[PDB]
Symmetry: C4
Subunit: 334 residues, 4 copies
């Protein structure tokens, strides 16, 4: 078929191959770039969703060396106050999301000391987005991350128009139904590869957004060219997320919903669902495990930093049965 | 490899459409299309010619929303003419009707009743008897004829040369179809549309993608690789306007939906190649069709395509694995 | 690696592509060669298993135009009597299985009027199978089908030593655990193709043995080069099979076991299991559906005979996802 | 495509061995193999060095049947020496024992206690510390050393150059392993054996295939593609002789089986990379081993191979799909 441009791989399709190593998981540097001008101690960002990130989550993230993006599902004043709450909790970095044409919101956020603006849309590669980007860059001084995209052409054009970071991901989210409602998407490993191929030569960080299920996925995302990953579902279950708590049967769940779900849209046909995730308690322990798995990954790959990981990493493509071998098999877990 | 292996076939679940630079919003795209070389539709949806899907009410519903319904042939000629008359007496609405091989008298009566298109459908559209029936209709009356079902370039080419005004594609992909297991025969639906489109497009003859549409995203996929429209069965079978009977099983209400090649449908009036099944009741078709149209607009927005013609020009896809598909649907989260 | 000789396809991996057709399913001729000198009206053979084929099953198959192979899990006299019961019921054709070195059994079966001897082994391409074959051919005159094999070299050697039919299948059987226990096998479509590539040069019929689950599988097997197919589990649940009945809940089951199962061997680690299949009633109806399915396949393929089907057939490889589209989906059966 | 992609990795389930012309019966095949450069076994089976699989009882059982057990290191040096002595006090019986990085003193005490082989084991064999430890051992004591775990040509080559007497292959394939999930790291076991044996065989150094053996047929596969032996954990964990404790859950007796990188094994004395699980109780190890050896003989008979060396020369395999896998197992029959 003439329109077939190749096979796309997701996190589950691959495994990273071990390298000769002289570096322990504990010695690895997880320091990375959020945007061309902003640095992070760990490569973790909490999603801009109303069931994931408000001030409490963003303080937690920043204290752990990562960063939180305050969602835009609220008035400008309430969003500015969330930013101020984080800035008033010490010298802590914080970000905030805006939509297309939201120049006024952007200005007010920047006035409030926000470190990065995340200009996000279901379809980053669009005329309205590029215009908003250009308007912001000419009217205020701040780093702008733009998303969401999955192609080299999208990456190249956004960078040409002033993007300080590029957020990658259409379809891989746990609550996303874009692939089913619209039939559109690119498997996340392939999308990071394609965007990194353009972005890295201009020094522009890729944020891998969506579909992180396990700590092993973080390593994979960074290995193929991401500077950081944005995480929703894994954190929505923690104590510091704004979601409500409901007892289903005997276990407690936190609400977690796409920002393109009918409920999130009430507060276009939906491209996200309203779901539940198991409660996980303090985010600190959750994040510790995530950082733990990534250090372990970099130790296996003999990489003392993310930059080194990019030069040293390789992967094998596996089958669904190879996936069976990867997980736990034939043993009941206690 | 084996000598008889002609390559890998892809279905809807095997691919994903790649986003393009877009200057067009979903609300702005034109869904206008051609049903046949002489008949146009405002949206590219057709309801299946099945006795659990399309009679007069469903056809009226379809036409009002800009699509079309094909009245099934599991009824006497007079009953079928009358159903067509119902739709025609309800405004100036377009409507189709199905006929079987050699049913020239039925075709004539349907055309006189003001039917807009005849659908000459068979389980195996690439056959001598079908072609004979086609030639005879085209010589005895003046009307557009859609012929199916086929899955190959040679079949598409032969039908067009003999006067087909539209080509219906699909052997095996239908939800109620067991052709692939009873006969071992079929072609995955993406590959079949591509093969047939590669021939029909230069002739300007529309391809109807028939069967296996489960989600709105499949419509986008089907059109993107060369279909001008899609024909839909199971999705509409559960609606208020379909003719099937309703059964309460446990708590939920179900509607009957059966293949026209199941034992029950063949009794109405060879081993079966369809099953008799049930689908959940979904209420008014308007809300169902609104979603489908909505998802297709979203698709065309992502693809920067203001029209179906542009969609054919601009679209590309990636093939994905089973684990890729798991990432497409909902994962690790319990839906409410 | 260097030992990877390619991808192997089974029935479920492929679909036959429709051809231009001027032949109705009812007009299709199903006549075929069982062996070089024995013909059948339909290409169906009942398996040589103690839960499938004794005289009643063999009479049933022969009346419908196929053939039954009386199993060897009984003393010589008992097997001869089974053969005599079929021959006493008209001119009806019948076959009988023997094992390696079973020359006396062969002689007796032949004297009793058997039409074909099936020299059966787990591993047909072995020195002692060849020696048994050579010994049979020089001491009596009948057609001998030899199996089971899956390679070109096996087929060539057996034919050169006097085989009148070649039986293909290691691993694909419903009750077979050879692939799990020994790690050995070849997917059935690839095995038929490989063996047909040699046998057809010599006019020697291929029997496709094991793994038929639906009538569609029969068409596939014949399409890629088989002259007939041997069937076990499908017939094992019919009233004519020797198996015993057992009520489980509200469903009636017939026992069905591999001849390499623990229970059959005491009638070496086992390579088959003891199982149950659902009771399907009269065998005539079952066979009607199978024949019906094959006629439909040959109608779609414009082939008026198996010979024409070999000439005209072609197939497409499908994915697991493709297979979900083949079966029934999203609709619950009544 | 994607530039960091080194190719498709195959696990045991992805392949099937192809039968060869055979003149050798299963009962006639020789299963004698080299454990290390200087140590031979009667059968190519090793019990895993885990605290729910191998202590003295298991090690004696393995040795009697022609294989060997590796005493785990989750105990003090004295306790470990004592296990080794018990096996040695039970006839002229082979035994191995594991040590970790820098555990030179432990190694010395084990060697003077008469251990036949030292297994220098780490989650990541291809590391500077492992190599240092290896060189240190080879210079201070006379003993065969098996090093692991690795999955690459370069790792295999470097370990051999620094004095390894055997190479243990396996990162991610074990039943209780979560390395592939937690760290995202691993190589499918067939591919890993092939790559490592491509180097090791040139030097005549035995490859041990460790983890992911689920059925006897997997042993055949592992050896066929170049392993000289296989290490097994879960299969032996449910036997009488494993040191794990029993627990009744429901109406079935289970024994505990846990990774040595599970939170409970590390508490026993980093983020965990193994789980704490349960396997069904299976009685005597002798019966279990008989079946395993039985399957391997059957495999070598199908391949016309009278010895493992001949099996390396003669073996070939075909890749299968998950649908081919369906066919391999039992299907459509309810097992009694
Ligand atoms: C309703 C849907 O919502 C989302 C989809 C995906 C991710 C989401 C993340 C957060 C919140 C909402 C999300 C959507 O906006 N869909 C959609 C589809 C196609 C579009 O195409 C365009 C567009 C095309 C050309 N110019 C401007 C916009 N916007 C689009 C929006
Ligand atoms: C029983 C089966 O019914 C159907 C199968 C598939 C789709 C259906 C949709 C609506 C109604 C019935 C359907 C069938 O007609 N099977 C069948 C199979 C092969 C055939 O081959 C020919 C044929 C070949 C050559 N010339 C004329 C007809 N008709 C055939 C019919
Ligand atoms: C126990 C197993 O049984 C069967 C396996 C597969 C199909 C069956 C069908 C009917 C009855 C029993 C069957 C078997 O015989 N396995 C087996 C495995 C390897 C062998 O290798 C040889 C052999 C090798 C070289 N020369 C002669 C025989 N016989 C073998 C038998
Ligand atoms: C906690 C984890 O434990 C295990 C993982 C896999 C297999 C196991 C088998 C038995 C016992 C524990 C196991 C681990 O050690 N992970 C880990 C991950 C990366 C590492 O990288 C290095 C390392 C890198 C460079 N030089 C020395 C060591 N050690 C590492 C350990
Ligand atoms: O409803 C929506 N539809 C599709 N994607 C969404 C929606 N809401 C949020 N997302 C994306 O999904 C990501 C979260 O992915 P997760 O970690 O896999 O749950 C977010 O960071 C957004 O990029
Ligand atoms: O019994 C039959 N066997 C095979 N296909 C059928 C049968 N009856 C209807 N169809 C086809 O299946 C389509 C419906 O597919 P669905 O939308 O996937 O439910 C119809 O438009 C016909 O092309
Ligand atoms: O126990 C056994 N192990 C392996 N194959 C067997 C055994 N018993 C019978 N077979 C084969 O399996 C075929 C039946 O396959 P089925 O039709 O798929 O049930 C028989 O005709 C034999 O070739
Ligand atoms: O906790 C762990 N994480 C990963 N691998 C382990 C762990 N503990 C033991 N292993 C490995 O897994 C093997 C057992 O694999 P199994 O036979 O598939 O159960 C052992 O011999 C070790 O190589």
């Amino acid at each position: 078929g003439t329109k077939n441009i190749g096979k796309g791989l997701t996190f589950e399709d691959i495994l990273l191959v071990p390298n000769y190593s002289e570096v322990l998981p504990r010695e690895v540097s997880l320091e990375t770039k959020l945007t061309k001008n902003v640095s992070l101690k760990i490569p973790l960002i909490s999603s801009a969703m109303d069931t994931v990130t408000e001030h409490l989550m963003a303080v937690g993230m920043a204290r752990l060396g990562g960063i939180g993006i305050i969602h835009k599902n609220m008035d400008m004043e309430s969003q500015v106050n969330e930013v101020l709450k984080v800035k008033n909790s010490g010298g802590l970095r914080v970000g905030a999301a805006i939509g297309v044409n939201e120049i006024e919101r952007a200005k007010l956020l920047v006035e409030a000391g926000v470190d990065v603006i995340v200009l996000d849309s279901a379809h980053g590669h669009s005329l309205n987005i590029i215009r908003t980007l250009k308007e912001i860059k000419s009217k205020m001084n701040i780093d702008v991350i733009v998303g969401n995209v999955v192609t080299e052409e999208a990456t190249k054009e956004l960078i040409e128009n002033g993007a300080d970071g590029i957020k990658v991901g259409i379809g891989p989210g746990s609550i996303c139904t874009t692939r089913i409602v619209a039939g559109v998407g690119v498997p996340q490993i392939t999308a990071i590869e394609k965007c990194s191929s353009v972005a890295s030569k201009f020094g522009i960080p890729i944020i891998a957004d969506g579909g992180i299920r396990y700590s092993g996925d973080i390593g994979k995302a960074l290995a193929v060219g991401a500077s950081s990953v944005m995480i929703g579902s894994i954190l929505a279950g923690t104590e510091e997320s704004p979601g409500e708590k409901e007892l289903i049967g005997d276990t407690v769940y936190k609400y977690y919903r796409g920002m393109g779900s009918v409920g999130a849209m009430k507060s276009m046909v939906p491209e996200g669902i309203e779901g539940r995730v198991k409660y996980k308690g303090e985010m600190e322990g959750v994040v510790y495990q995530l950082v733990g798995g990534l250090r372990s990954c970099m130790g296996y790959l003999g990489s003392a930093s993310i930059e080194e990981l990019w030069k040293k990493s390789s992967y094998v493509e596996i089958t669904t049965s190879g996936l069976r071998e990867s997980h736990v098999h034939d043993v009941e877990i206690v």
